[PDB]
Amino acid sequence: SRSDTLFLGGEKISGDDIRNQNVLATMAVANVVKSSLGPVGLDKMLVDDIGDFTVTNDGATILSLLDVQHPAGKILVELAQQQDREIGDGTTSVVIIASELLKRANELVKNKIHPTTIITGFRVALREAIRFINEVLSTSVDTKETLINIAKTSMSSKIIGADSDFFSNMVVDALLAVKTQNSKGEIKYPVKAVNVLKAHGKSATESLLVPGYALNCTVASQAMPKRIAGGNVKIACLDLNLQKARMAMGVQINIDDPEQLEQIRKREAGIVLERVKKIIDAGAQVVLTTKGIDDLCLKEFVEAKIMGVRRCKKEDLRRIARATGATLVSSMSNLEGEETFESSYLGLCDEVVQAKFSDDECILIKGTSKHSSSSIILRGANDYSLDEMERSLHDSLSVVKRTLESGNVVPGGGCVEAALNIYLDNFATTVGSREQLAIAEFAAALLIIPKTLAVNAAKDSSELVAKLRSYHAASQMAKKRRSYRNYGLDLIRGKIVDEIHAGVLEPTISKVKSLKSALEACVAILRIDTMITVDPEPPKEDPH
């Protein structure tokens, strides 16, 4: 035995046991969320071991709440949160593909295949797989009509699926209508998105979109107006923190002979108000700071009937000022010598009304100089849902962005993942020999998804998938069209149906970034045969 090194707490598994422990560890994190995907799929609830719950159908967020014990599992969790960065949706699915790739890969080396051969069998099947995407996604460049379809397909297999068509547009419209920027000669929609809130209580369907931002804040002093509308309003996003003023540190104050301690006491406050007025004198319809206004400096912004908001969200006053044409001012001084302020700093909106939403109230900002402001204020039964409703939002808004930032889209619904299944094996198997058996499993591993889309329905679905096969295989082989292929799964009603004929549609990007990373993960684990795991640092527990 051994001696080897080093125990205790430091151990290592070898060859078979690892290649297995790795696969088990992957099917683990995988098989949990293998129910989620597909319209037929459901949501789950995770317990904060302190009672607190959290209902969610998202695969990414769901795996995070799992805790990811072990290297192989956490590796998938890491691959998950990658997908949101690429896309935003499909996290639930990407994990599956990967897991299935290992599952099968190992089931090959368990057949004494050897990993090197396999790791290439994917390396190739992957490239050719994208080469087939070149035939599928391209036809999906031309087909606002098909944008509401993509935003809708991002609703199914989700809570907001029941109100899909309704929120399908609330999603599209804010980004399409009011959310466009431009940096260094590039046009793109907010990959950081547009403020979205949640309204406790109220109706499901009645989630109010807004023709402006929805800064979540309350009026500084009650004495201020609760609304200032009409047209051409004076907005001011001032991060000056115009509250008070204390001596500059390191600049101590020792007085004498006076009898002048008072001659500057007020002078400390004066310089504050002097700057406050200098700004109020340029517009001051509404003032929005980040640091906050002071009681002794609110009375001044109050008497003038100027709405003032104490300490706002810095990430907001930016997006707000960018739409109203204003300029989020940092320091008062502008060149030297300057106080200063210029009416050229203020913004341009229509209404600044502080609305109400069930025991709560937030200030809205409707209309802007540049018409780019959108804020969707959800509203449902409990926080437990109103939050998850947002998850379907953050995960659907994305699917659109990625789409509108890449002309190419793809017929989802198990369609693509079905064509590849037939296409590579029937047509990839030119090399043959052993490498063939590898490519094969790489294609077979793809069916994993279409399968679960069906198994999600209690009813025997072994056949519904069998049909999706013969159909898709029909595009070429075997033994001027009209092309009889391109169909897909209609989970809602059993039997195949053309997906393009339906609202269903997933961005090509998503079908790539996920197909690609699912491989690297798989590979990286294939190369594994020994996991040395050394114990951490124990407590001193010194007998002396």
Binding site: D67, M247, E259, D295, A381, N382
Partner: protein, 509 residues
């Protein structure tokens, strides 16, 4: 780390956990719903029928059960009357919708099947609509008063509430400007309703008792300042290099104190309310101006007096203006016996409305305001939305016989869903009868016949014998309530119906 229950084997534990919470609210319904004495921690001990407080001070372990107890307050804020009912509906809504889960194809066919429900039902809930004059609101405000221990004096409160609502006085009335003192003792009919602000503020002017007990035509100044020797905000230190610059500094202290009130009396003030206490020196220099001064007033309070009086709160007296002083009729600090209290009322067109109550122990009083709020609020619900619904569970039975009609008129395998939603709404009046039975069941079919060809209204009385007719009876629940109560009841179940697995640990990683 831990296990997890999934599938139907768990889907159930979600439902029966839902029904579980509602089971503890059946007694509470308007008619003879008996008060529940709930002992809580720390040493809190409440008693009433107000759902969003009988459940609030009642903790629950399960997830589903924790979603229900949430809809309670999820509803109370929105309208603020459908406390007891929303839970009772949300729950029963799943019980009669469960056997359609397994026997039904999926949990998602039921989802879509519920939309066509809430949509249609909200419609039927709009058919039975009434118009509010905006005196006559006293007719509806009676109903909120009726369940709780306000019935004994149903009249006295309805007025005390629509009056408080009346004062403010904005398109939207914020009950944040409607303080509610609750003095112990006297008689429940002794619960006046001042048109100003009541303060536990004892004999103002802590220097001496010289300041006027009350003043006719007071010209108030409400300040957030400190009114005491200000200290250098910028960390300053003194250096007495001189020999008698010590006495001169000591003077500079009492000086600024005088210069302080000096420019505050210039507004011809005869009474000042400072959020912060005042130094004895500045307590005297102004005292010779026969002006009253009360300090330690709460931040929120000095906002009620901000609308009552009319003067605007201002900081740094130097820049004081004539538009800062106010006009209120009097300030009399009558003793509540053993404990003082400064009252301040009057002023035309004033929003603030502090309605002091009376009766029994501090706890008795509590449950009074507790239900009083249910009143005050129930009138705003009807005021912001001027239209009402046929109460008495009639509205409920209506959407039940209406949906039920839609049942057969549906060609699909998801028919068994709309049906469920219907059957569950009949249960809304069910307890109304079961709380005054025996027996609830016989009266059920009675309303079904009446609704069919007995016109929309006509529900169950809470007297109660049984069947009646609400428009005649005089129990009309503001549509706004019933609207959202049903909506809150259906959607939460839908989210919960969407669940098929429960994990028992968190990273949060």
């Amino acid at each position: 780390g831990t296990d997890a229950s999934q599938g139907k084997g768990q889907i159930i534990s979600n439902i029966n956990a839902c029904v579980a919470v509602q089971e503890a609210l059946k007694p509470t319904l308007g008619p003879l719903g008996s008060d529940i004495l709930i002992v809580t921690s720390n040493q809190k001990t409440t008693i009433s029928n107000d759902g969003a407080t009988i459940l609030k001070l009642l903790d629950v372990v399960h997830p589903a059960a924790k979603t229900l107890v949430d809809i309670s307050r999820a509803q109370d804020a929105e309208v603020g009357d459908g406390t007891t009912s929303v839970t009772i509906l949300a729950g029963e809504l799943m019980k009669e919708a469960k056997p359609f889960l397994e026997e039904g194809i999926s949990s998602h066919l039921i989802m879509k099947g519920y939309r066509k429900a809430v949509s249609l039902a909200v419609e039927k809930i709009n058919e039975l609509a009434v118009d509010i004059t905006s005196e006559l609101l006293e007719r509806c405000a009676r109903t909120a008063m009726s369940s709780k221990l306000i019935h004994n004096n149903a009249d006295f409160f309805v007025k005390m509430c629509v009056d408080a609502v009346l004062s403010l006085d904005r398109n939207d009335l914020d009950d944040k400007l409607i303080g509610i003192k609750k003095i112990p003792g006297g008689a429940m009919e002794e619960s006046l309703f001042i048109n100003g602000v009541a303060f536990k503020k004892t004999f103002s002017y802590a220097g001496f008792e010289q300041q006027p007990k009350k003043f006719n035509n007071p010209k108030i100044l409400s300040l957030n300042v400190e009114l005491e020797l200000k200290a250098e905000k910028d960390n300053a230190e003194v250096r007495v290099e001189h020999v008698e610059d010590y006495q001169a500094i000591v003077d500079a202290e009492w000086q600024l104190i005088f210069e302080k009130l000096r420019q505050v009396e210039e507004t011809g003030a005869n009474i000042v309310l400072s959020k912060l206490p005042i130094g004895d020196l500045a307590t005297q220099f102004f005292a010779d101006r026969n002006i009253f001064c009360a300090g330690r007033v709460s931040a929120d309070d000095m906002n009620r007096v901000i609308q009552a009086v009319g003067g605007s709160i201002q900081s740094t007296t130097s820049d004081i203006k004539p538009e800062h002083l106010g006009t209120c009729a009097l300030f009399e600090e009558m003793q509540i016996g053993s404990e003082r209290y400064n009252l301040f009322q009057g002023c035309p067109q004033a929003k603030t409305c502090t309605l002091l109550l009376r009766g029994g122990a501090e706890q008795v009083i509590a449950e009074v305001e507790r239900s009083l709020h249910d009143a005050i609020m129930i009138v705003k619900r009807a005021l912001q939305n001027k239209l009402i619904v046929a109460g008495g569970g009639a509205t409920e039975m209506e959407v039940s016989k209406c949906l039920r009609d839609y049942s057969k008129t549906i060609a699909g395998k998801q028919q068994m869903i709309i049906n469920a939603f219907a059957k569950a709404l009949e249960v809304i009046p069910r307890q109304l009868c079961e709380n005054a039975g025996f027996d609830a069941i016989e009266i059920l079919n009675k309303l079904r016949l009446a609704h069919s060809k007995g016109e929309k209204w006509y529900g169950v009385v809470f007297e109660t014998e049984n069947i009646g007719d609400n428009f005649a009876k005089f129990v009309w629940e503001p549509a706004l309530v019933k609207i959202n109560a049903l909506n809150s009841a259906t959607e939460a179940t839908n989210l919960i119906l969407s669940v098929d697995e429960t994990i028992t640990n968190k990273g949060s990683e």
